[PDB]
């Protein structure tokens, strides 16, 4: 019942929060967030992310309006197909996010874009 | 009070629209010297917001003023700058847009002024990027679509006319921004308007007005 990937933004986090309060963050198998997703945090309680660690690629963890998806690492063999499949596990909604495969210690911007576009959710993508 | 200095300037702008260019620099300089609190900045925002949403023909002037203050005020409190506080205030009425569009006549009238202020804000509000500084507020581009959707979803005459006004004001800019990004929001809009004409119980004159938008936009 919600729009198919509208995507993009230039405005800051608090500014983009006008549209929605829902955030999509990217984590590794240890439950540790990637740098871009770590920056997106503004004093939220992240204890819940260690409570169920470790995670399998594709595991989704949500508490309140914060969503976290376990993504494959390219520097450890991860492929674009694996990345897209992990994102398809994300419940369809409107999210403020970053590029998943960003960037060094991961996928290219085009590969991260492809995976977000392959997803059915609508995104508001902050740059890193 | 500091609040009454601001309201007097807002009232002065209403009475003398041509005074903006020669008096705006002095307004910013005075505010830079006296606004030093998070609460004082919050108050400045509230006063401008109220004038823009409650006073007729202040939609354009309000938006023009907001853009200028956003990049000419030096204060940067830890709760957010002028721009951030302004945008947060808009989020408040925006959150209930679905409810406001189905409210009583007075609630709807208030909503219409909010919508048209956001339309002027979209056009006037400039945002500087990392490489491309010449950008509009993208969140407003999205917000305006949702506000239009909200208006067409409650197809009462006043809501519909508000949407017509908003599309006359911003339609060309939105049309170009959507076409450049390969989005079909304009086509969606046209179809939503067509569905209103087909199904809605509103006045024939409003429907005729809507049909004429179909000729212009496509």
Numbering used by the authors:
A (entry chain A): 389 to 516
B (entry chain B): 78 to 295
Paper's wording?
SARS‐CoV‐2 and SARS‐CoV share an otherwise non‐conserved part of non‐structural protein 3 (Nsp3), therefore named as “SARS‐unique domain” (SUD). Paip1 acts as a positive translation stimulator to regulate the key translation factor PABP in the host translation system. In addition to receptor usage, the potential of a zoonotic virus to establish itself in a new host will depend on its ability to cope with the innate immune system of this host and possibly with its capability to use the host's protein synthesis machinery for its own benefit. Our study provides new insight on the latter aspect for SARS‐CoV by demonstrating that the SUD‐N (Mac2) domain interacts with the host cell translation apparatus via Paip1 and increases viral translation.
After trying many optimization methods and testing over 240 crystals at the synchrotron, we managed to collect a 3.5‐Å dataset. The structure of the Mac2:Paip1M complex was finally determined by first using the SAD data to position Mac2 in the asymmetric unit and then employing molecular replacement to locate Paip1M. One Mac2:Paip1M heterodimer exists per asymmetric unit. Mac2 adopts the typical α/β/α macrodomain fold. The main structural difference between the two Mac2 structures is located within the N‐terminal segment Lys389–Thr408. However, the β‐strand is replaced by a loop in the Mac2:Paip1M complex. In the Mac2:Paip1M complex, this region is a long loop, while it forms a β‐hairpin in free Paip1M. About 840 Å2 of the surface of Mac2 and 779 Å2 of the surface of Paip1M are buried upon complex formation, according to the PDBePISA server (complex formation significance score: 0.86 on a scale from 0 to 1, Krissinel & Henrick, 2007). The predominant interaction regions between Mac2 and Paip1M are confined to the N‐terminal loop Ile394–Leu407 of Mac2 and to α5 (Arg160–Arg168), the central loop (Ile204–Thr212), and the N‐terminal half of α7 (Ala214–Glu223) of Paip1M. Taken together, the N‐terminal Lys389–Thr404 region of Mac2 is indispensable for the interaction with Paip1M.
